[PDB]
Design a protein around this ligand. Structure first.
Ligand SMILES: CCCCCCOCCOCCNC(=O)c1ccc(C(=O)O)c(C2=C3C=CC(=[N+]4CC(F)C4)C=C3[Si](C)(C)c3cc(N4CC(F)C4)ccc32)c1
Ligand SMILES: [Ca+2]
Ligand SMILES: [Ca+2]
Ligand SMILES: [Ca+2]
Ligand SMILES: [Ca+2]
Ligand SMILES: [Cl-]
Length: 464
Protein backbone atom coordinates (compact mmCIF):
# COMPACT_ATOMS: atom_id res chain seq x y z
CA UNK A 1 0.00 0.00 0.00
CA UNK A 2 1.90 3.03 -1.29
CA UNK A 3 2.81 6.47 -0.06
CA UNK A 4 0.67 9.32 -1.24
CA UNK A 5 3.60 10.90 -3.01
CA UNK A 6 4.16 7.83 -5.07
CA UNK A 7 0.59 8.19 -6.43
CA UNK A 8 1.16 11.83 -7.29
CA UNK A 9 4.28 10.86 -9.19
CA UNK A 10 2.41 8.09 -11.10
CA UNK A 11 -0.35 10.65 -11.92
CA UNK A 12 2.22 13.14 -13.18
CA UNK A 13 3.66 10.46 -15.46
CA UNK A 14 0.24 9.93 -17.08
CA UNK A 15 -0.23 13.70 -17.34
CA UNK A 16 3.00 13.68 -19.47
CA UNK A 17 1.78 10.51 -21.26
CA UNK A 18 5.21 8.95 -20.82
CA UNK A 19 7.11 6.76 -18.51
CA UNK A 20 10.03 8.50 -16.90
CA UNK A 21 10.71 10.96 -14.23
CA UNK A 22 8.13 13.75 -14.71
CA UNK A 23 9.67 16.19 -12.36
CA UNK A 24 13.40 16.18 -13.53
CA UNK A 25 14.14 19.94 -13.36
CA UNK A 26 16.67 20.32 -16.43
CA UNK A 27 19.10 21.68 -13.69
CA UNK A 28 21.75 22.64 -16.27
CA UNK A 29 25.21 22.91 -14.47
CA UNK A 30 24.52 19.26 -13.54
CA UNK A 31 24.33 18.41 -17.20
CA UNK A 32 27.58 20.27 -17.79
CA UNK A 33 29.10 17.88 -15.26
CA UNK A 34 27.68 14.63 -16.51
CA UNK A 35 29.75 12.58 -18.85
CA UNK A 36 29.02 12.90 -22.65
CA UNK A 37 26.04 15.27 -22.14
CA UNK A 38 28.15 18.17 -20.78
CA UNK A 39 30.55 17.87 -23.72
CA UNK A 40 27.67 17.77 -26.30
CA UNK A 41 26.30 20.97 -24.74
CA UNK A 42 29.46 23.06 -24.23
CA UNK A 43 31.89 21.69 -26.80
CA UNK A 44 29.51 20.66 -29.75
CA UNK A 45 26.72 23.23 -29.26
CA UNK A 46 28.67 25.98 -27.59
CA UNK A 47 25.96 26.46 -24.91
CA UNK A 48 28.34 28.01 -22.39
CA UNK A 49 28.96 30.96 -24.74
CA UNK A 50 25.47 31.18 -26.30
CA UNK A 51 23.18 30.45 -23.29
CA UNK A 52 25.20 30.53 -20.07
CA UNK A 53 27.19 33.74 -20.61
CA UNK A 54 24.19 35.98 -21.57
CA UNK A 55 22.30 34.45 -18.59
CA UNK A 56 25.16 35.84 -16.38
CA UNK A 57 24.28 39.39 -17.34
CA UNK A 58 21.06 41.22 -16.36
CA UNK A 59 21.19 43.70 -19.21
CA UNK A 60 21.19 42.02 -22.70
CA UNK A 61 24.59 41.66 -24.24
CA UNK A 62 24.77 43.35 -27.62
CA UNK A 63 25.92 41.52 -30.65
CA UNK A 64 29.14 43.38 -30.72
CA UNK A 65 29.82 42.11 -27.18
CA UNK A 66 28.68 38.58 -27.94
CA UNK A 67 31.14 38.52 -30.80
CA UNK A 68 34.06 39.51 -28.67
CA UNK A 69 33.24 36.69 -26.20
CA UNK A 70 32.68 34.22 -29.04
CA UNK A 71 35.81 34.84 -30.90
CA UNK A 72 38.32 32.58 -29.03
CA UNK A 73 35.89 29.73 -29.31
CA UNK A 74 34.88 29.82 -32.95
CA UNK A 75 36.42 26.47 -33.55
CA UNK A 76 34.75 23.66 -31.52
CA UNK A 77 38.11 22.02 -30.78
CA UNK A 78 39.17 25.20 -28.79
CA UNK A 79 36.33 24.76 -26.27
CA UNK A 80 38.00 22.47 -23.77
CA UNK A 81 38.43 25.17 -21.09
CA UNK A 82 34.72 26.05 -21.16
CA UNK A 83 33.77 22.53 -20.27
CA UNK A 84 36.64 21.74 -17.84
CA UNK A 85 35.97 24.77 -15.65
CA UNK A 86 32.44 23.92 -14.69
CA UNK A 87 33.52 20.35 -14.02
CA UNK A 88 36.17 21.89 -11.65
CA UNK A 89 33.62 23.94 -9.63
CA UNK A 90 33.58 22.93 -6.06
CA UNK A 91 29.98 21.67 -5.66
CA UNK A 92 28.67 19.14 -3.28
CA UNK A 93 32.16 18.21 -2.18
CA UNK A 94 33.41 17.42 -5.70
CA UNK A 95 36.03 17.52 -7.03
CA UNK A 96 37.74 16.96 -3.72
CA UNK A 97 41.04 18.64 -4.69
CA UNK A 98 39.37 21.92 -5.63
CA UNK A 99 37.10 21.90 -2.68
CA UNK A 100 40.17 21.46 -0.34
CA UNK A 101 42.24 24.17 -2.02
CA UNK A 102 39.21 26.54 -2.05
CA UNK A 103 38.50 25.86 1.63
CA UNK A 104 42.20 26.56 2.46
CA UNK A 105 42.13 29.88 0.71
CA UNK A 106 38.84 30.89 2.34
CA UNK A 107 40.41 30.11 5.68
CA UNK A 108 43.54 32.10 4.90
CA UNK A 109 41.13 34.86 3.82
CA UNK A 110 39.20 34.86 7.10
CA UNK A 111 42.51 35.31 9.05
CA UNK A 112 44.36 37.66 6.65
CA UNK A 113 44.57 41.47 7.33
CA UNK A 114 44.83 42.17 3.66
CA UNK A 115 42.47 44.99 2.65
CA UNK A 116 39.46 43.53 0.87
CA UNK A 117 36.81 45.01 -1.46
CA UNK A 118 33.79 42.79 -2.14
CA UNK A 119 31.36 43.74 -4.99
CA UNK A 120 28.02 41.95 -5.07
CA UNK A 121 24.63 42.14 -6.99
CA UNK A 122 21.03 40.87 -6.64
CA UNK A 123 20.35 38.03 -7.23
CA UNK A 124 23.95 37.00 -7.97
CA UNK A 125 24.97 33.52 -9.15
CA UNK A 126 27.97 32.32 -7.12
CA UNK A 127 27.51 34.82 -4.34
CA UNK A 128 23.90 35.53 -3.35
CA UNK A 129 23.30 38.66 -1.29
CA UNK A 130 22.92 36.64 1.89
CA UNK A 131 26.47 35.25 1.34
CA UNK A 132 27.79 38.70 0.46
CA UNK A 133 26.51 40.06 3.80
CA UNK A 134 27.90 37.19 5.82
CA UNK A 135 31.40 37.77 4.21
CA UNK A 136 31.41 41.51 4.60
CA UNK A 137 31.03 40.79 8.36
CA UNK A 138 33.38 37.84 8.83
CA UNK A 139 36.34 38.81 6.57
CA UNK A 140 38.75 41.39 8.04
CA UNK A 141 39.15 44.80 6.57
CA UNK A 142 36.35 44.07 4.06
CA UNK A 143 34.30 46.74 2.41
CA UNK A 144 31.28 45.50 0.50
CA UNK A 145 29.75 47.54 -2.35
CA UNK A 146 26.16 46.74 -3.75
CA UNK A 147 26.17 47.07 -7.56
CA UNK A 148 22.40 46.76 -7.88
CA UNK A 149 21.20 44.18 -10.18
CA UNK A 150 23.76 41.60 -11.02
CA UNK A 151 24.19 37.97 -11.82
CA UNK A 152 27.72 36.81 -12.53
CA UNK A 153 29.49 39.21 -14.87
CA UNK A 154 28.95 42.21 -12.60
CA UNK A 155 31.39 44.06 -14.76
CA UNK A 156 28.77 44.07 -17.61
CA UNK A 157 25.93 45.41 -15.43
CA UNK A 158 27.77 48.21 -13.60
CA UNK A 159 31.23 48.87 -14.73
CA UNK A 160 31.28 52.50 -13.77
CA UNK A 161 30.50 51.88 -10.17
CA UNK A 162 32.98 48.96 -9.90
CA UNK A 163 35.73 50.90 -11.61
CA UNK A 164 35.26 54.11 -9.59
CA UNK A 165 35.08 52.26 -6.29
CA UNK A 166 38.26 50.33 -7.07
CA UNK A 167 39.95 53.65 -7.99
CA UNK A 168 38.89 55.07 -4.69
CA UNK A 169 39.78 52.08 -2.54
CA UNK A 170 43.15 52.04 -4.20
CA UNK A 171 44.12 55.48 -2.88
CA UNK A 172 43.25 54.42 0.70
CA UNK A 173 45.86 51.55 0.38
CA UNK A 174 49.54 51.83 1.07
CA UNK A 175 51.02 51.39 -2.37
CA UNK A 176 52.51 53.92 -4.79
CA UNK A 177 28.73 50.98 -21.48
CA UNK A 178 31.41 50.62 -24.11
CA UNK A 179 31.79 47.58 -26.40
CA UNK A 180 35.26 48.54 -27.87
CA UNK A 181 38.58 47.01 -26.75
CA UNK A 182 41.16 49.80 -27.31
CA UNK A 183 44.04 48.06 -25.58
CA UNK A 184 47.31 47.36 -27.24
CA UNK A 185 47.98 43.58 -27.25
CA UNK A 186 51.02 42.40 -25.36
CA UNK A 187 52.40 38.92 -25.12
CA UNK A 188 54.71 37.17 -22.90
CA UNK A 189 56.40 33.74 -23.13
CA UNK A 190 54.95 31.41 -20.48
CA UNK A 191 55.83 27.64 -20.21
CA UNK A 192 56.59 27.56 -23.94
CA UNK A 193 53.35 29.39 -24.85
CA UNK A 194 52.37 33.04 -25.40
CA UNK A 195 49.88 34.55 -23.16
CA UNK A 196 48.07 37.81 -24.09
CA UNK A 197 47.72 40.64 -21.69
CA UNK A 198 46.59 44.24 -21.45
CA UNK A 199 49.28 46.42 -19.91
CA UNK A 200 48.40 50.16 -19.45
CA UNK A 201 48.96 52.94 -16.90
CA UNK A 202 52.13 54.29 -15.38
CA UNK A 203 55.19 51.96 -15.34
CA UNK A 204 56.07 52.71 -11.74
CA UNK A 205 54.17 51.76 -8.66
CA UNK A 206 52.18 48.85 -7.45
CA UNK A 207 50.44 47.11 -10.33
CA UNK A 208 46.87 46.08 -10.36
CA UNK A 209 46.41 42.62 -11.80
CA UNK A 210 42.92 41.81 -13.11
CA UNK A 211 41.89 38.10 -13.49
CA UNK A 212 38.90 36.97 -15.47
CA UNK A 213 37.07 33.70 -15.23
CA UNK A 214 34.93 31.38 -17.44
CA UNK A 215 33.92 32.04 -20.28
CA UNK A 216 35.39 35.48 -20.53
CA UNK A 217 38.70 37.18 -21.23
CA UNK A 218 40.44 40.45 -20.38
CA UNK A 219 37.51 41.85 -22.43
CA UNK A 220 35.39 41.72 -19.26
CA UNK A 221 37.57 44.34 -17.71
CA UNK A 222 37.43 46.82 -20.56
CA UNK A 223 35.21 49.38 -18.86
CA UNK A 224 36.83 48.97 -15.44
CA UNK A 225 40.48 49.43 -16.33
CA UNK A 226 40.04 53.07 -17.63
CA UNK A 227 39.10 54.13 -14.06
CA UNK A 228 42.32 52.67 -12.60
CA UNK A 229 44.91 53.21 -15.36
CA UNK A 230 45.35 57.02 -14.77
CA UNK A 231 46.93 56.22 -11.37
CA UNK A 232 48.11 52.57 -11.48
CA UNK A 233 49.58 50.03 -13.90
CA UNK A 234 46.76 47.66 -15.00
CA UNK A 235 47.78 44.09 -16.15
CA UNK A 236 44.89 42.02 -17.46
CA UNK A 237 45.92 38.64 -18.85
CA UNK A 238 43.99 36.20 -20.84
CA UNK A 239 44.08 32.75 -19.20
CA UNK A 240 45.78 30.03 -21.16
CA UNK A 241 43.38 28.61 -23.75
CA UNK A 242 41.26 31.71 -23.45
CA UNK A 243 40.97 35.21 -25.08
CA UNK A 244 43.97 35.81 -27.31
CA UNK A 245 46.43 33.56 -25.52
CA UNK A 246 47.82 30.41 -27.08
CA UNK A 247 45.81 27.22 -26.89
CA UNK A 248 48.00 24.32 -26.10
CA UNK A 249 46.67 20.84 -25.97
CA UNK A 250 45.99 20.62 -22.23
CA UNK A 251 43.04 19.35 -20.34
CA UNK A 252 42.60 22.86 -18.82
CA UNK A 253 42.21 21.76 -15.20
CA UNK A 254 42.53 24.34 -12.47
CA UNK A 255 46.03 23.15 -11.79
CA UNK A 256 47.06 23.91 -15.43
CA UNK A 257 45.79 27.41 -14.98
CA UNK A 258 47.65 27.64 -11.59
CA UNK A 259 50.87 26.88 -13.35
CA UNK A 260 50.32 29.25 -16.28
CA UNK A 261 49.26 32.12 -13.92
CA UNK A 262 52.27 31.62 -11.57
CA UNK A 263 54.60 31.58 -14.55
CA UNK A 264 52.76 34.64 -15.99
CA UNK A 265 53.34 36.67 -12.82
CA UNK A 266 57.03 35.63 -12.74
CA UNK A 267 57.55 36.31 -16.42
CA UNK A 268 56.34 39.84 -15.81
CA UNK A 269 58.89 40.24 -12.91
CA UNK A 270 55.99 41.35 -10.69
CA UNK A 271 56.68 41.78 -6.94
CA UNK A 272 53.91 43.21 -4.86
CA UNK A 273 50.47 43.58 -6.56
CA UNK A 274 46.82 44.49 -5.95
CA UNK A 275 44.48 41.72 -7.22
CA UNK A 276 41.11 42.37 -8.83
CA UNK A 277 39.49 39.08 -9.50
CA UNK A 278 36.35 37.38 -10.65
CA UNK A 279 34.96 33.69 -10.93
CA UNK A 280 37.84 31.28 -11.72
CA UNK A 281 40.21 34.32 -11.70
CA UNK A 282 39.27 34.60 -8.03
CA UNK A 283 40.31 31.01 -7.36
CA UNK A 284 43.60 31.67 -9.08
CA UNK A 285 44.09 34.95 -7.25
CA UNK A 286 43.21 33.79 -3.80
CA UNK A 287 45.22 30.63 -4.17
CA UNK A 288 48.21 32.72 -5.28
CA UNK A 289 47.59 35.20 -2.42
CA UNK A 290 47.60 32.43 0.14
CA UNK A 291 50.87 31.17 -1.21
CA UNK A 292 52.50 34.69 -1.55
CA UNK A 293 50.73 36.70 1.18
CA UNK A 294 53.58 39.30 1.62
CA UNK A 295 53.18 40.21 -2.07
CA UNK A 296 49.49 41.07 -1.98
CA UNK A 297 48.51 44.63 -0.94
CA UNK A 298 44.80 44.33 -1.55
CA UNK A 299 42.10 42.18 -3.10
CA UNK A 300 39.04 43.40 -4.88
CA UNK A 301 36.74 40.54 -5.76
CA UNK A 302 33.36 39.69 -7.00
CA UNK A 303 31.32 36.60 -7.85
CA UNK A 304 34.08 34.40 -6.59
CA UNK A 305 34.59 30.68 -6.12
CA UNK A 306 33.66 29.38 -2.75
CA UNK A 307 32.53 25.91 -1.91
CA UNK A 308 28.90 25.33 -2.74
CA UNK A 309 27.92 22.59 -0.30
CA UNK A 310 24.87 21.20 -2.13
CA UNK A 311 23.05 21.12 -5.46
CA UNK A 312 19.87 22.39 -3.67
CA UNK A 313 20.86 26.14 -3.63
CA UNK A 314 20.48 29.82 -4.93
CA UNK A 315 22.53 29.01 -8.13
CA UNK A 316 21.32 25.50 -9.26
CA UNK A 317 17.60 25.22 -8.06
CA UNK A 318 15.18 27.71 -6.47
CA UNK A 319 12.82 27.03 -3.46
CA UNK A 320 9.86 28.22 -5.42
CA UNK A 321 7.64 25.87 -7.36
CA UNK A 322 6.43 27.41 -10.65
CA UNK A 323 2.80 28.43 -11.23
CA UNK A 324 2.20 25.54 -13.69
CA UNK A 325 3.66 23.16 -11.09
CA UNK A 326 1.23 24.45 -8.46
CA UNK A 327 -1.69 24.20 -10.82
CA UNK A 328 -0.81 20.58 -11.76
CA UNK A 329 -0.40 19.86 -7.98
CA UNK A 330 -3.79 21.45 -7.41
CA UNK A 331 -5.38 19.06 -9.92
CA UNK A 332 -3.65 16.17 -8.14
CA UNK A 333 -5.00 17.35 -4.82
CA UNK A 334 -8.50 17.50 -6.34
CA UNK A 335 -8.41 13.88 -7.37
CA UNK A 336 -8.19 13.02 -3.69
CA UNK A 337 -10.31 15.76 -2.22
CA UNK A 338 -13.30 14.51 -4.13
CA UNK A 339 -15.86 16.52 -2.17
CA UNK A 340 -13.97 19.70 -2.80
CA UNK A 341 -13.64 20.82 0.88
CA UNK A 342 -9.92 21.56 0.74
CA UNK A 343 -8.83 18.72 3.03
CA UNK A 344 -8.03 15.04 2.19
CA UNK A 345 -9.34 12.56 4.77
CA UNK A 346 -8.66 8.85 5.24
CA UNK A 347 -12.06 8.02 3.63
CA UNK A 348 -11.05 9.94 0.52
CA UNK A 349 -7.74 8.24 0.37
CA UNK A 350 -9.60 4.93 0.94
CA UNK A 351 -11.87 5.71 -2.01
CA UNK A 352 -8.92 6.20 -4.31
CA UNK A 353 -7.07 3.19 -2.93
CA UNK A 354 -10.09 0.84 -3.36
CA UNK A 355 -10.60 2.20 -6.93
CA UNK A 356 -6.94 1.09 -7.75
CA UNK A 357 -7.82 -2.46 -6.56
CA UNK A 358 -6.24 -2.44 -3.07
CA UNK A 359 -8.10 -2.80 0.30
CA UNK A 360 -6.42 -0.64 2.91
CA UNK A 361 -7.37 -0.80 6.53
CA UNK A 362 -8.21 2.29 8.53
CA UNK A 363 -4.85 2.07 10.26
CA UNK A 364 -3.03 1.95 6.85
CA UNK A 365 -4.87 5.04 5.61
CA UNK A 366 -4.27 6.92 8.90
CA UNK A 367 -0.60 6.16 8.39
CA UNK A 368 -0.61 7.33 4.84
CA UNK A 369 -1.96 10.67 6.30
CA UNK A 370 0.64 10.53 9.14
CA UNK A 371 3.30 10.65 6.44
CA UNK A 372 2.04 13.97 5.06
CA UNK A 373 0.07 15.73 7.87
CA UNK A 374 2.38 18.37 9.33
CA UNK A 375 0.24 19.62 12.10
CA UNK A 376 -1.49 16.58 13.69
CA UNK A 377 -5.13 17.22 12.96
CA UNK A 378 -5.20 14.05 10.83
CA UNK A 379 -6.19 15.38 7.39
CA UNK A 380 -4.04 16.85 4.62
CA UNK A 381 -4.49 20.49 3.39
CA UNK A 382 -2.95 21.75 0.23
CA UNK A 383 0.10 23.48 1.76
CA UNK A 384 1.16 20.03 3.34
CA UNK A 385 0.51 18.49 -0.05
CA UNK A 386 2.87 20.92 -1.63
CA UNK A 387 5.46 20.28 1.14
CA UNK A 388 5.21 16.60 0.34
CA UNK A 389 5.72 17.24 -3.44
CA UNK A 390 8.51 19.81 -3.15
CA UNK A 391 10.46 17.07 -1.47
CA UNK A 392 9.24 14.25 -3.78
CA UNK A 393 10.50 16.28 -6.74
CA UNK A 394 14.18 16.31 -5.59
CA UNK A 395 14.51 12.58 -5.36
CA UNK A 396 12.03 10.46 -7.22
CA UNK A 397 15.33 8.61 -7.67
CA UNK A 398 15.72 5.98 -4.69
CA UNK A 399 15.34 2.52 -6.23
CA UNK A 400 12.97 1.69 -3.49
CA UNK A 401 10.97 4.68 -4.85
CA UNK A 402 11.14 3.33 -8.35
CA UNK A 403 9.99 -0.12 -7.27
CA UNK A 404 7.18 1.45 -5.30
CA UNK A 405 6.02 3.44 -8.38
CA UNK A 406 6.30 0.27 -10.50
CA UNK A 407 4.00 -1.56 -8.12
CA UNK A 408 1.20 0.93 -8.52
CA UNK A 409 1.37 0.51 -12.32
CA UNK A 410 1.70 -3.35 -12.07
CA UNK A 411 -1.63 -3.81 -10.49
CA UNK A 412 -1.66 -7.66 -10.33
CA UNK A 413 1.94 -7.81 -9.16
CA UNK A 414 3.17 -10.15 -11.93
CA UNK A 415 6.20 -7.95 -12.85
CA UNK A 416 4.63 -6.61 -16.11
CA UNK A 417 2.75 -3.43 -16.79
CA UNK A 418 0.14 -4.28 -19.37
CA UNK A 419 -1.89 -1.89 -21.46
CA UNK A 420 -4.98 -2.80 -19.44
CA UNK A 421 -3.24 -2.01 -16.20
CA UNK A 422 -2.03 1.32 -17.47
CA UNK A 423 -5.46 2.43 -18.47
CA UNK A 424 -7.05 1.35 -15.21
CA UNK A 425 -4.35 2.99 -13.05
CA UNK A 426 -4.34 6.32 -15.08
CA UNK A 427 -8.14 6.54 -15.14
CA UNK A 428 -8.43 6.01 -11.42
CA UNK A 429 -5.78 8.72 -10.89
CA UNK A 430 -7.83 11.04 -13.21
CA UNK A 431 -5.63 10.94 -16.33
CA UNK A 432 -7.63 10.15 -19.51
CA UNK A 433 -5.41 8.56 -22.06
CA UNK A 434 -6.52 7.66 -25.57
CA UNK A 435 -5.60 4.37 -27.13
CA UNK A 436 -2.84 5.95 -29.29
CA UNK A 437 -1.37 7.54 -26.13
CA UNK A 438 -1.47 4.33 -24.09
CA UNK A 439 0.18 2.35 -26.94
CA UNK A 440 2.67 5.06 -27.47
CA UNK A 441 3.52 5.39 -23.70
CA UNK A 442 4.08 1.58 -23.56
CA UNK A 443 5.88 1.47 -26.92
CA UNK A 444 8.50 4.01 -25.86
CA UNK A 445 9.51 1.88 -22.84
CA UNK A 446 9.00 -1.63 -24.22
CA UNK A 447 12.48 -2.49 -25.37
CA UNK A 448 11.80 -6.23 -25.99
CA UNK A 449 8.61 -5.47 -27.93
CA UNK A 450 6.30 -7.81 -25.92
CA UNK A 451 3.64 -4.93 -25.55
CA UNK A 452 4.31 -4.80 -21.77
CA UNK A 453 6.70 -2.92 -19.46
CA UNK A 454 8.72 -5.00 -17.08
CA UNK A 455 10.85 -3.84 -14.24
CA UNK A 456 14.15 -3.37 -16.09
CA UNK A 457 12.44 -1.42 -18.79
CA UNK A 458 10.66 0.84 -16.25
CA UNK A 459 13.95 1.40 -14.32
CA UNK A 460 15.60 2.37 -17.70
CA UNK A 461 12.90 5.11 -18.31
CA UNK A 462 13.07 6.37 -14.74
CA UNK A 463 16.89 6.87 -14.59
CA UNK A 464 17.65 7.90 -18.32
C1 LIG B 1 31.75 30.28 -12.90
C2 LIG B 1 30.29 30.33 -13.18
C3 LIG B 1 29.88 31.60 -13.85
C4 LIG B 1 28.97 31.44 -15.05
C5 LIG B 1 28.15 32.68 -15.34
C6 LIG B 1 26.73 32.46 -15.80
O1 LIG B 1 26.01 31.68 -14.83
C7 LIG B 1 24.75 32.21 -14.45
C8 LIG B 1 23.65 31.49 -15.15
O2 LIG B 1 23.82 30.09 -14.96
C9 LIG B 1 22.72 29.33 -15.43
C10 LIG B 1 23.14 28.66 -16.71
N1 LIG B 1 21.97 28.28 -17.49
C11 LIG B 1 22.06 27.93 -18.77
O3 LIG B 1 23.14 27.86 -19.36
C12 LIG B 1 20.77 27.65 -19.50
C13 LIG B 1 19.58 27.29 -18.87
C14 LIG B 1 18.42 27.07 -19.59
C15 LIG B 1 18.40 27.21 -20.98
C16 LIG B 1 17.11 26.93 -21.71
O4 LIG B 1 17.04 25.86 -22.36
O5 LIG B 1 16.19 27.75 -21.60
C17 LIG B 1 19.59 27.59 -21.62
C18 LIG B 1 19.73 27.76 -23.10
C19 LIG B 1 19.74 29.09 -23.60
C20 LIG B 1 19.42 30.15 -22.69
C21 LIG B 1 19.45 31.46 -23.09
C22 LIG B 1 19.80 31.80 -24.39
N2 LIG B 1 19.85 33.18 -24.75
C23 LIG B 1 19.38 34.35 -23.99
C24 LIG B 1 20.28 35.16 -25.00
F1 LIG B 1 19.66 36.19 -25.62
C25 LIG B 1 20.53 33.85 -25.86
C26 LIG B 1 20.14 30.77 -25.30
C27 LIG B 1 20.14 29.42 -24.91
SI1 LIG B 1 20.55 28.08 -26.07
C28 LIG B 1 19.39 28.18 -27.54
C29 LIG B 1 22.30 28.13 -26.73
C30 LIG B 1 20.30 26.52 -25.17
C31 LIG B 1 20.46 25.29 -25.80
C32 LIG B 1 20.27 24.09 -25.09
N3 LIG B 1 20.38 22.84 -25.72
C33 LIG B 1 19.94 21.54 -25.23
C34 LIG B 1 20.39 21.05 -26.65
F2 LIG B 1 19.39 20.50 -27.38
C35 LIG B 1 20.84 22.51 -27.07
C36 LIG B 1 19.89 24.12 -23.76
C37 LIG B 1 19.74 25.31 -23.13
C38 LIG B 1 19.91 26.54 -23.82
C39 LIG B 1 20.75 27.80 -20.89
CA1 LIG C 1 -12.24 16.45 1.22
CA1 LIG D 1 -3.01 18.38 8.56
CA1 LIG E 1 0.87 -6.83 -14.20
CA1 LIG F 1 8.60 -5.30 -22.61
CL1 LIG G 1 32.68 27.58 -14.76
Amino acid sequence: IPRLDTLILVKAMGHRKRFGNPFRPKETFQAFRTTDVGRKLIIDQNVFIEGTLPMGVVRPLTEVEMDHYREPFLNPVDREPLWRFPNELPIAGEPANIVALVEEYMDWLHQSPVPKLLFWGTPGVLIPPAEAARLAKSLPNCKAVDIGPGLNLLQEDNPDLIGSEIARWLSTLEISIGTGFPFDPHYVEVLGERMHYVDVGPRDGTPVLFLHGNPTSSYVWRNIIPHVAPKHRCIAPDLIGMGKSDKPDLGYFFDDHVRFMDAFIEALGLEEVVLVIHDWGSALGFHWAKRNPERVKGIAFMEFIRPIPTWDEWPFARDQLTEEQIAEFKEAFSLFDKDGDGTITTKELGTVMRSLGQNPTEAELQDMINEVDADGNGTIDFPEFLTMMARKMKDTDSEEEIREAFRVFDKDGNGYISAAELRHVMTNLGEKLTDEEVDEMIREADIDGDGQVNYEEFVQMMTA
